[PDB]
Amino acid sequence: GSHSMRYFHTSVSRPGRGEPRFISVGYVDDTQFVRFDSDAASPRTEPRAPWIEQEGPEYWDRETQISKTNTQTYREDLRTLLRYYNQSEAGSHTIQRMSGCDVGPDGRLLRGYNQFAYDGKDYIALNEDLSSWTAADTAAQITQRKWEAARVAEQDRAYLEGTCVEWLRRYLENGKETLQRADPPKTHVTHHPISDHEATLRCWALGFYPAEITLTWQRDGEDQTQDTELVETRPAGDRTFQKWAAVVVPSGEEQRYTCHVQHEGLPKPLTLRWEP
Amino acid sequence: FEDLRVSSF
Amino acid sequence: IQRTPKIQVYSRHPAENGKSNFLNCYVSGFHPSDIEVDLLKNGERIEKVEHSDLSFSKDWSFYLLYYTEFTPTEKDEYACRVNHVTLSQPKIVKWD
Numbered sequence: 001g002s003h004s005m006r007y008f009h010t011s012v013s014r015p016g017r018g019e020p021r022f023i024s025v026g027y028v029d030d031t032q033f034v035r036f037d038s039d040a041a042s043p044r045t046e047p048r049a050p051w052i053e054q055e056g057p058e059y060w061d062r063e064t065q066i067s068k069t070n071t072q073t074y075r076e077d078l079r080t081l082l083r084y085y086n087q088s089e090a091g092s093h094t095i096q097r098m099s100g101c102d103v104g105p106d107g108r109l110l111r112g113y114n115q116f117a118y119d120g121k122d123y124i125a126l127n128e129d130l131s132s133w134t135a136a137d138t139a140a141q142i143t144q145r146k147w148e149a150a151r152v153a154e155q156d157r158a159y160l161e162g163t164c165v166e167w168l169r170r171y172l173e174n175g176k177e178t179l180q181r182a183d184p185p186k187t188h189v190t191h192h193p194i195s196d197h198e199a200t201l202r203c204w205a206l207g208f209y210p211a212e213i214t215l216t217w218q219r220d221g222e223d224q225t226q227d228t229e230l231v232e233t234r235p236a237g238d239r240t241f242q243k244w245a246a247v248v249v250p251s252g253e254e255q256r257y258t259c260h261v262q263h264e265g266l267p268k269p270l271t272l273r274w275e276p
Numbered sequence: 277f278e279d280l281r282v283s284s285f
Numbered sequence: 286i287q288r289t290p291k292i293q294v295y296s297r298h299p300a301e302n303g304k305s306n307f308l309n310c311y312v313s314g315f316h317p318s319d320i321e322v323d324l325l326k327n328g329e330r331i332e333k334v335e336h337s338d339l340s341f342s343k344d345w346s347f348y349l350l351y352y353t354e355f356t357p358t359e360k361d362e363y364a365c366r367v368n369h370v371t372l373s374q375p376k377i378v379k380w381d
Contacts, residue, residue: 007278008340010347012318025338026278035338048338059277066280077285084285094317096345099278117345120288120316123285143285155282167277206299234311235337236297237352 001264002110003029003179005168006100011074013093020078022071028171028179030211031239036067043068051175081118084139094119101164107172112160130157183209183240184265189274194248201274202246203259207236214262215245221258288346289371290315294364294380300357308355308380310365313348321368321375322351327361 006027013020025048026034033049045063047053077095087093096117102110115125122136124143131153135144147153172179185205193199205215211233217224229246236242249257254274261270290312297307308331310322318339324331337350355363363380 010318010339010341023339024278025340027340032338032340037338063278066278070281073281073284080285092317092319096341098341098343119286120345121286122345146285147283150283152283159279163277163279231293232291232311232313234293234295234309234313235350237307237309237350238297242295 001105002102003168003172004100004102005164005171006098006113009070009074009095009097009099011071011078011095013078013091015089015092020071020075022067022074024067024070028168028175030209030241031175031179033171033175034063036064038068038071043071049175049178051171051178054174081139084142085118095123096120099160101160101168103165103168107165107169109161109165112157112164114156114160126153126156130160178239181209182263182265183207185213185243185261185263187259187261187270187272189259189272191254191274191276193251197251198248199251199254200246201249201254201257201259202244203261203272205243205261205263207240207242208263208265209240210264211235211241212264213241213243214260215243216260217245217247218258218260219247219249219253220256287371288314288316290320290367290369290376292365292367292376292378294378296357296380297352302358303356305354305356307352308363310351310367310378311348312351312367313342314346315348315369315371316346317370318347319370320347320349321366322349323366324351324353325362325364325366325377326355328364331355 008025010023011020022038024036031049033052035048036045045060045067074095078093099114101112104110111128112130116123124140125134127134133144135141185208188204190202191199217228224247231244233241233243259272291314293311295309308324310324324334331353334351334353341347364377366375366377368375
């Protein structure tokens with residue numbers, strides 16, 4: 001169906017320990033496909049998914065230079081933010097950027113992104129119109145004035161509508177075997193007595209792709225959002241994801257509980273119960 | 277494919 | 286303003302005694318990005334554990350997956366030990 005491409009940049013200062021490290025990682029949906037690390041012995045844009053390996057030498061050489069120049073821009077930006085926030089040169093600080101585009105099943109642009117954070121807090125973000133900015137504070141307003149004067153949004157828009165959509169379309173085709181395959185969750189319900197009058201019912205979902213999933217418990221067909229322990233979806237390391245949802249139930253009331261599973265890979269949502 | 281940063285802060 | 290890691294220790298596949306698997310430790314929701322993660326076999330650090338490339342979520346919080354190949358048994362106890370600026374002591378989460 002719908003797809004996304006994202007690049008995640010992280011630059012971290014380390015006063016007294018050399019220059020800030022730059023990392024850029026690229027994803028199509030929940031699949032990482034490229035990495036660059038300025039701390040690597042010989043920094044280079046490297047493949048991280050089999051379907052990107054076919055890209056020619058011009059791809060790797062161009063991306064490596066872009067990431068090497070970007071490494072320097074983020075070092076300049078960390079210096080700039082020490083001035084805008086009246087901070088000392090003693091502490092470690094972080095700049096992060098998320099950029100990318102989403103497309104629909106036809107490959108048409110749904111929306112683009114270009115947003116940044118400083119110390120894990122929003123800094124400046126390109127609005128959905130790809131023409132205006134949202135600055136989080138008076139320091140980000142200085143960057144906003146600088147970016148309005150230099151018509152930066154126009155340049156970001158051009159990448160997001162063109163290059164970003166075009167390459168996502170190419171990657172989806174080259175990786176169609178995996179990027180365009182949904183693996184449904186493999187599900188089961190476990191039961192563990194906690195004491196003589198309470199037991200835990202845990203609903204499992206394993207081996208699914210993409211990561212997006214809904215796992216819920218119902219008691220007498222009513223959602224138990226407040227009484228459910230829901231772990232964050234976690235990677236298995238083989239491309240797939242895992243998740244579980246648990247409820248503490250009164251002994252003898254297990255059959256009043258149902259686990260409901262929604263996933264792209266499922267033609268219809270599943271209903272599970274504890275099967276003694 | 278990612279490009280150069282358009283402008284610094 | 287910092288964010289402490291959420292930690293999960295688990296296997297790639299349901300564990301079967303005598304069968305090769307992967308032991309994972311997933312750290313997520315933390316800020317800043319520097320973090321220390323060890324995988325433990327009967328209280329001892331496992332060597333040459335590998336990790337995923339640094340990335341982060343929509344809310345800017347970072348995540349990493351640490352992993353190593355292992356063959357579980359009835360006697361062998363596995364865990365993850367995590368240190369982060371937000372923690373006064375390292376946090377140990379045992380594999381169930």
